[PDB]
Symmetry: C3
Subunit: 265 residues, 3 copies
């Protein structure tokens, strides 16, 4: 990886965004590497959680002006052939992919949180903010549509709060972001961040990977199909988990007050 | 009823979940009794609210291990004839049915709130927690899918807050449950809990029964169909209500600065 | 306009509801004039924002009895032809229209906010409450279904908080209204109300009109079609904006550390 530092750490992969020189501005190249890492871990057993963090006290400054310059310089198509379409769309593919990943996705969100980075925060299972975290959508002030980001902001916090943020192009701080639900928690120091992150990784260790993945997929279906058919499907998944190896293991563990296999070390 | 105490009390049915010995663990039998009570009152016009409360300071400890034992020992099945399927699915049927009941459903949640109990709280029109209420999804921790509960958590508080509770299997206190919208209010004493309950029941007395039920049914349709057609249907319901008994009665009551008949 | 005082200031149309005599009870005539104004400005490119305010310290005290009496007098009919149908439906028509307007809609809500007024507040891009603001749904208390208003309350604040307000016929104050998301901010006094308005109008000045409009329409689509197809269309809108007058102008503005033309004082 050119753009990211990877580190295994028990059942959890730490992904550090590694371009502190340009405040982690997000380039097409990064997008592709993120897409790749998430595709590779998707059907991997040892990885239960993925932590997203930026090197240098900044999560993401925005896009990379260079990819835009690059795309202007290419031949103009008009459709999905247009280099600006292709450039922009890949941000949404990757964000959506991360949203639907079978892994527990944790975003540690420091300093600037913009563009693609704001999107990633909007699709995490847990987001923790550092006290300098700033979240903004200045796009319309530049005559640009926040096309790939705003839709995840609507899912994240709802239409009512998203309207205000997106259409007035506001920049907000960690405390307001937490109140709105962009992030779940705010840490008042670099220390508290660590504790909060560790507590959450503790939680990941105790939770069963297959059950966690099946649950997560059920959650994304709520509200997009009738509840009754969803619950039918949910009950089949329950019956299947009970008769499969994880549920078997989990029963034994509660019998003897001991930790289950997936939770050891 | 064997798992529930039913007490009528004006236009309000008080349903007390009554297995204090096992801190109100929810059994298939309880599921069936709840489902039956709610079908029976669905049209009984003298009942306007149902209050759900657990005896002995706990709402629901979880599922009944004995129902699972029972299912294990039955003959295994393919898919929807699997006994685990039937057992689990019945919980979601009851919860969905409570959610769509034409009555105003108030939940009073104290102590442990888990499994079916958590689901019921997530499906109430008003939920009031006592200071000791704890809400947890420990399921994935035991290699179990919280299949019939988590979906109602998502409906109740949104995907963003539900993914965190469910996927980290957290257990939260009343204040956090209120802040997220699992419950609407938190009492700080048993007394404050009674008063809030009584204020809510007073509001139920003042509200017209057929209009409350029609309104409720429309609230559930929002976001599951095109808004323009919903408003069309809603305007027909408006017209019908105005023609009918309650509208007539309601306008007069306001004209004569007096309580309407359903408030009696 | 018979019920409304209209005032233009910059690209902001200030619409003042003007029946202080009856605390701004919303008549069928008011509904018709509101719908007319929003139809006309929909293309007028000199208007960027519409501000809704009430005269005399109240936003809307409810429906107009006169319209109801009028409707009882008319020939009864069935379904679409029922005069009660017609009377009711038009309120939702207008509210939906205002919800989807291309303009940034700001609601300034004081005193009573009920009926159509509550509905409007629930479809604003930004709502600011003054300290006297009171929001209620007394309809079922009168044997009436709040048919046109409640569906927007559900979109505004969610089913969970809306079931309580609506089905117990509650009336709440400004700070509870803010906590639930009916309004986005609350003022302590008159002059704070003015600052908040001016700050919002400043943000409107800085945001480019066409991009604001395209973004707003993408936002209303979220949750009502598959995400992937929506991001497809979003990227198309992004490309077209980049290659349009507004996008070219905006990059310029940022090249020469100068305001873009749409910001022009």
């Amino acid at each position: 990886c050119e753009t990211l530092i990877l580190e295994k750490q028990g059942p959890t992969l730490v992904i550090t965004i590694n371009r502190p020189d340009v405040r982690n501005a997000m380039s097409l190249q990064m997008v592709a590497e993120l897409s790749t890492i998430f595709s590779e871990i998707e059907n991997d057993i040892s990885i239960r959680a993925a932590v997203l963090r930026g090197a240098g006290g900044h999560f993401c400054a925005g896009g990379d002006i260079k990819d835009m310059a690059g795309a202007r310089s290419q031949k103009a198509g008009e459709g999905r052939d247009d280099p600006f379409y292709k450039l922009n769309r890949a941000f949404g593919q990757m964000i959506q992919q991360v949203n639907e990943s079978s892994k527990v996705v944790i975003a540690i969100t420091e300093g600037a949180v913009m563009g693609g980075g704001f999107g990633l925060a909007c699709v995490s299972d847990l987001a923790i903010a550092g006290p300098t975290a700033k979240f903004g959508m200045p796009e319309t002030t530049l005559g640009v549509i926040p096309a790939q980001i705003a839709p995840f902001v609507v899912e994240r916090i709802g239409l009512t709060q998203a309207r205000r943020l997106a259409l007035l192009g506001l920049r907000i701080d960690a405390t307001e972001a937490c109140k709105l639900g962009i992030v779940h928690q705010v840490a008042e120091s670099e220390e508290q961040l660590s504790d909060m992150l560790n507590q959450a990784l503790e939680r990941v260790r105790l939770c069963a990977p297959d059950a966690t993945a099946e649950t997560k997929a059920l959650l994304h279906r709520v509200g997009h199909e009738a509840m009754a058919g969803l619950l039918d499907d949910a009950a089949e998944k329950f019956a299947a988990a009970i008769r499969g190896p994880e549920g078997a293991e989990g029963t034994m563990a509660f019998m003897q007050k001991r930790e289950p296999k997936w939770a050891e070390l």
